[PDB]
Symmetry: D2
Subunit: 346 residues, 4 copies
């Protein structure tokens, strides 16, 4: 089968021919119908040799949707042909976090050698992929696979981040979304669907601010030195109830701290090495909590899929073939994908 793999440290990923895998006991083989590109793949491929720990080669893609092609021995709960999304952040399934579906916060996974697809195990950027267990598949019914693939991370991650503080986001609240890319453009829509928050989007790029308004942002602010003051002018001086920072650069985190309300929240979702919030007296408002959330829970993925099925999420995508996978990663690097890149095999 055809796959896109990271094969050499510091090199672009390549299209390869590798064996179609066979599912062992408990496993499911999917025919991949769509595989999302996430900017985290760029972080992974930019790691120096000393830090990179996912093994080579690595079939990329941790945003996967497919149809069940083959059931491993003992698997029930799915039939051949069933359309499914892959729950990405695999946990041990047994610990207290996993018992609540919070496999994203499993502390046993590392020691047990459990790695996610596209991030230590073979990913979805291939004609076929293996899933370890039935509990990591969520049915999507007749959802368009191209728009469904991003739900598994571009949807799941903002959904989880928002869910952690949803009780704060009542009528009269304001939520700031910083970074209107793959995650952020879905984040805006989740906020509109599950809360009555007023949504202010922030981006460097005017076309991304246009995208923000297209997907339901109430206001759009240019990122940079003026952003904090502009956001404060929009919130009447009180600041924003919650800031969801999908960039996570020091400058955006600083913006977030300068605008968050007393008893509000900053969610640092975007990853920029070294960047951090400074949470201490006189540096942040009283009661304003800060967290770096990770991925999301099993039930949260189901909820994201339910939003999509109800017509609440307009996922902006551009489609690529497997052959175009490396080109798509170059596009993601340069910031020229308006929303989420999605590879559609064959």
């Amino acid at each position: 089968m055809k796959a896109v793999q990271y094969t050499e440290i510091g090199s672009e990923p390549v299209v390869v021919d590798i064996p179609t895998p066979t599912p062992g006991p408990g496993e499911i083989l999917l025919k991949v119908t769509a595989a999302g590109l996430c900017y985290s793949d760029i972080h992974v491929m930019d790691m120096p040799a000393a830090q990179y720990a996912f093994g080579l080669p690595l079939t990329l893609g941790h945003e996967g949707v497919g149809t069940v092609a083959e059931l491993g021995e003992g698997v029930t709960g799915f039939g051949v042909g069933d359309a499914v999304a892959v729950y990405g952040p695999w946990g041990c399934g047994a610990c207290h976090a996993c018992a609540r579906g919070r496999e994203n916060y499993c502390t046993r996974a590392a020691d047990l050698g459990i790695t996610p697809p596209g991030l230590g195990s073979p990913g979805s950027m291939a004609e076929y992929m293996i899933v370890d267990s039935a509990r990591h598949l969520v049915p999507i019914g007749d959802l368009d696979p191209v728009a469904a693939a991003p739900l598994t991370d571009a949807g799941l991650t903002p959904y989880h981040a928002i869910s952690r503080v949803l009780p704060l986001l009542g009528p009269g609240s304001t939520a700031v979304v910083i970074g209107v890319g793959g995650l952020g453009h879905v984040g805006i829509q989740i906020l509109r669907a599950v809360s009555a928050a007023r949504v202010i989007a922030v981006d460097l790029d005017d076309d991304r601010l246009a995208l923000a308004r297209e997907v339901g942002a109430d206001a759009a602010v240019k990122s940079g030195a003026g952003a904090a003051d502009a956001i404060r002018e929009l919130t009447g001086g009180q600041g924003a109830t919650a800031v969801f920072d999908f960039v996570g650069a020091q400058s955006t985190i600083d913006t977030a701290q300068q605008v968050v309300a007393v008893d509000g929240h900053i969610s640092v979702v975007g990853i920029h090495a070294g960047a951090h919030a400074k949470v201490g007296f006189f540096m942040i408002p009283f009661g304003a909590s800060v967290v770096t959330p990770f991925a999301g829970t099993r039930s949260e993925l189901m909820e994201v899929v339910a939003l999509a099925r109800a017509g609440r999420l307009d996922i902006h995508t551009e489609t690529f073939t497997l052959d175009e996978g490396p080109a798509a990663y170059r596009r993601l690097r340069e910031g020229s994908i308006r929303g989420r890149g999605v590879v559609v095999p064959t």
Copy 2:
């Protein structure tokens, strides 16, 4: 009346004779029965002239309990003689936070000129004190005033900090308490009363570790460079579900970040200027939230009082006269009060 006031920047507070105040409309005059000393008073008196904004003179004391002495015009809901605790962090009463009793997070109070007693308005370190409104009094019934005065901040603040994340602190959880002083020794007891968390106390001083064990800590370990490893050995490598840092120095915040569990919590309660948690990827576990909480809510003060009345809080105090107030502040500075200092007028 006799009062203890901060009167000159950089100087020790002094015992003064000033007029007994008279309550205006809506106000209540209390005869103070106990006034707690909080280390925040030390922070206030150490502010340089450029930062200090509470006015001079300032009658100290933001931990106050008393008996109703005089009702201002229009006040009902209290009779003369009623024993009451003063809710300290006065808000506007009208905004969305205040409407939920969360006057500690009122953003309108500053612009309206509303300041708390002992921190801009006259405090409880005096024979009498004024309270602005009935909603800032909580009845304490027959609670011993000496043990009650600390409830208003030493109790309230940890109670609020713990309450923010109480749903995390189920059976099998671990809570670390750093700093077993006024706040911390009450924090341990609140954790034991309202959760099934295992409680690990941390302090510099071995006598404070003994205090921690006396008030129900499951383990008590020495603060400093070895504390993170010692705490991890106790938690089996998984770390602590929540860390309540009542010191808030950079070294204790660093300890907190090195021990907090995935999806846990750090509450930076103690105040040390410039100190901060560094909340970013690779610097803290996934899902571990960090906050600097402030004071507590109206209903939280009532709950603290209810814990005290039920016998769940053994408040360790040392009692001082008004005349000894300045000496008590010196004792607080040097760290020689085992628990909370309380002035009794």
Copy 3:
């Protein structure tokens, strides 16, 4: 001043001339700009002499909006001319419930002689009204008073009922609204604004089903013996996550029990004497909680006002003069007000 009062047990309310009140210390005099009619007023006026406890005469109206006309001695926080809504369910202000703004659940109010306007104290169906304390006023800014008056009960009560179980109403959930009148037509809109629940409206009257669809219900079905089966067909056999019953008749409560999901919720909001849910094993699904909520909290009223100001609530009203107040009550009795009746004094 002109007022509408209940003056004789069993008789229609009457238009009267009574003294314009003067505010004592702590009180505020409002010039009433709009006064809502609630079906609870019908329940009150239908009480026999032995049950009726609100005193005669009683100026009706517990849904009040006005402008501050006179400040009593010592009142600050409001200026003359400020547009305000009256928080209805007055409590003691001092107990643990009141300290959280939950004056609706105050247990001390009765013993202290504290009664709400229109329900023991003089109401808003008059040119002027007294409010006991500043904490019972919420600013409405430039909101149209006619559409604002219903927020104080038609908005507040459903808002509170929904808020009690808002965490259940995630994506994929279904909420049933029974009774699309004053409360119900606002309840539908609150559900759409603060949740991603699919909303199924139920009413006896086809025109009310049309109203339900106009204000955003996803489906609207006829009440009665077939309603439970029709709702189950819409929910795929799993039943409804939550049922908000704004009728509260035995037949509607029975419908609610026959459709509620496992681990769901029934909120019995409507008042029909003797009617009750039967909460016991084999009579209701496992984990399905049932409550009779009452009014709402101070912060909830502020949130309702915030929804209205954000354009999320289209309040359907019909306007009456004070002189038409008794006629409006006859209209409410016969069920011919499409939404909420509102008296506008002048």
Copy 4:
């Protein structure tokens, strides 16, 4: 192997000799170390032929602890000899409830033919028992099996019931526990461990009231006509914040409604056919919710085990052999087991 089975409708269970089962793929064979008797087994054996649906014969016992004896094909995560408690209310593992560990509220289990051990599948009152999946085992380490077996239902069920409303049970709250048997005597202890609620225990039997005080009840009240007044005298007239009714007879539910506070909670946990709360205006306080909870969640079982391991639960038991199993059921019927009956296979 020896087992205790219900074999004939209306007859006492019998000691039988049946084949030792062998684990199929995914299954685990446990050597049973302790098997709890629950009064629900009495309800099951009293069902007429027309209602009884669990098949005959049925190996009783849905409170099971054991050691891993044999691993089925594919099972890892447990080693032979590991001490484990069985999570009883088996669900499908895949639905939204199950994804959160809430298999107790699974709606798919019935249609998939999934039944719990002792309640449709073979139970723990045998020398060995099969568990369907690793996710239904929770490690107990060196916990005494006799005191551990009741945790799986006598602990789990009250724990779940309490957990549903734990935020109500702050300092100053009162919780009433009605019925100080298997469940109730553990319920008291959970309340003391996880809340600062004052606990009032209610029972018919003075020896059970003594047991209540032994396990930490603050007060003990004789059940019956005087109980409501006695409880109100203890709560100062305000009533009880929460009532956990482990009897669920009409008289105890009536007591519960007569004592529950405004904005409180009644949890009807005990099963008495036909008995129900009457939740309607004028029949219950405003805001007082009522539910019939069922079993508990996966993570709740882990928490119960954690309480036991921390020394917070003193489980009162009487031990029986397998041969004495039928005698133990007679003892349970007559109400002569002080706490929980536990069979220990030889």
